[PDB]
């Protein structure tokens, strides 16, 4: 079949995936903070 690319599913998936990794990257950096 000739499937499309940008779809409603694509939107949804990204609304969760994009912030997630951005957070996973943020948290990963926190592991090195100290005092």
């Amino acid at each position: 079949v000739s499937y499309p690319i940008f779809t409603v599913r694509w939107v949804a998936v990204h609304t969760l995936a994009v912030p997630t990794i951005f957070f996973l990257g943020a948290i990963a950096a926190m592991q090195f903070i100290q005092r």
Partner: protein, 82 residues
């Protein structure tokens, strides 16, 4: 048992996907990393740094005591080098 969307199996398997996402996915990661490591996150959410919970001598907590003049009261708490 099927709809318009392109079957995940194909996409997660397609070389084109990875050619894209080997760039995109690490990019966000490094971005989130910088968000913290540059101390920006501290200012965006007013989260105290390890040396910004109390004043040097003070051992009291900066508890907000009134709603309407809270914002003003909060700023006053930052004043005492907190």
């Amino acid at each position: 048992g099927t709809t318009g969307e392109r079957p995940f199996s194909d996409i997660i398997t397609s070389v084109r996907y990875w050619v894209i996402h080997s760039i995109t996915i690490p990019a966000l990661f490094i971005a989130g990393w910088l968000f913290v490591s540059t101390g920006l996150a501290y200012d965006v959410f007013g989260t105290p740094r390890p040396d910004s919970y109390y004043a040097q001598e003070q051992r009291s907590i900066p508890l907000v005591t009134d709603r309407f003049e809270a914002k003003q009261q909060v700023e006053t708490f930052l004043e005492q080098l907190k």
